[PDB]
Amino acid sequence: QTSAVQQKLAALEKSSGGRLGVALIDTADNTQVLYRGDERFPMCGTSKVMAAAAVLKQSETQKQLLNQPVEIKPADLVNYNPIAEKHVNGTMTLAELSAAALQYSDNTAMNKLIAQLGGPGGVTAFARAIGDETFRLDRTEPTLNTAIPGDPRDTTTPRAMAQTLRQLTLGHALGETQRAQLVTWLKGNTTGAASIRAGLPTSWTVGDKTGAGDYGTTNDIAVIWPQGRAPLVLVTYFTQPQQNAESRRDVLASAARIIAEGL
Template sequence: MKKLLLLLGLLASSSVTYAAKLNEDLAAIEQHIGGRIGVSVWDTQNDEHWDYRGDERFPMMSTFKTLACATMLSEMDSEKLDKNATAKVEERNIVVWSPVMDRMAGQTTRIEHACEAAMLMSDNTAANIVLRSIGGPNGVTRFLRSIGDGATRLDRFEPRLNEAKPGDKQDTTTPNAIVNTLHTLLEGDALSYESRIQLKIWMQDNKVSESLMRSVLPKGWSIADRSGAGGFGSRGITAMIWKENHKPIYISIYITETDLSLQARDQVIAQVSQLILDEYNTI
């Protein structure tokens, strides 16, 4: 028993030491980039939480797309929205970065297909089609309130929601709030089992985040994620990682208020991801 207590004490001490070092590292990166970093980590294996500016607001950017598609899936679960619902892709509604819907102008698409395009390719027109089918940005916010997220809010459509103006609460979340919500969506009872699986598959099949956390993910780990980019040097990623014999770890990383290029922001997200993942590489 004494040996067990000593071991538990050493593990707790190691965790505290790691957290203190990570705080120092993130503060140093912040100083270097001249902006803010927000991080939240929830290891459900041992129910350990850690955050850095976890309750401060950060622009969601395209990480909102997971929440919009979850709202759509919830409405399909409750039969408020037909599973085969469709919408016309109006040419006048095509917005910047729409690699899928750009080729479908004038055609009809299933709302579920629009979600797939939004999640896998971050297609902005597809995301707007989904939003219009669920009551707009306010529909997402209402859904989030109904599942216990009192912080995250969506106010605008693409691409305006990516403005990321410092101090503006529109279209923002907190690192802690979105990590908790991801857990609720992927492992809680907010969605049906089939919808939870579908949301996870879309996140696993993300095609636009290879330069971020995926680039430093240790061998043997799997990832489901959604990334975002916006004004004022903003970038973000929300993810669930897991491996055999280890329950999911939920992670959110946001940076904002920088003058960094997109490539430099990607490098910062990867660097912060590496610092976090180093803790779990030996598990």
């Protein structure tokens, strides 16, 4: 059985030609609205939130960890390194790496976060530690974005990622200082204007992390503070049947617009 919300999302999905996954959590009453909420989707860059959060968790017991400089070698650079390329034969702190990964989608920066955690398995272990039983990170950048049909690697479900993003940004999966830091990073994201943000009232404060990959995979996860009501968490995942499909950030904006109706 479906609600009008789910029917609108299904119609959007059909018109888009792809596969859409949505999870909304309204913290006013802890209700969820889901569309393909328990299907796996390739996370691509939305996985950078889990890696940054894992390092924040480490820093709760290692207080200067975020300010630890990490060497950036020429050999570290991968396919998209807008911030890290400014620091080749130099350093970035774990805070700077987190900001670059989250706010500029820097893939080299993500690889340093992954390395700090001991590899993709370290990121997954953090996910399990905060109660996310679904998330899995298997690969480093750039191959974690291959988004191959049927491939379980580097996937999660909309429901799981929404629950986790809520716990990280509004709940207490992290310490208070670290939660605030993650919120600050997400709020300052530079890559999200055309995605969930484009489908929501401009007066709402939004923190988000985008992701993109092959199969026209177009993703965004967001924490949302509407004017005068409890915050929301929204995950919108989208992927398409053919490997070189075009990005569709408009589909994410449309999904957000549908979800926002009545709120």
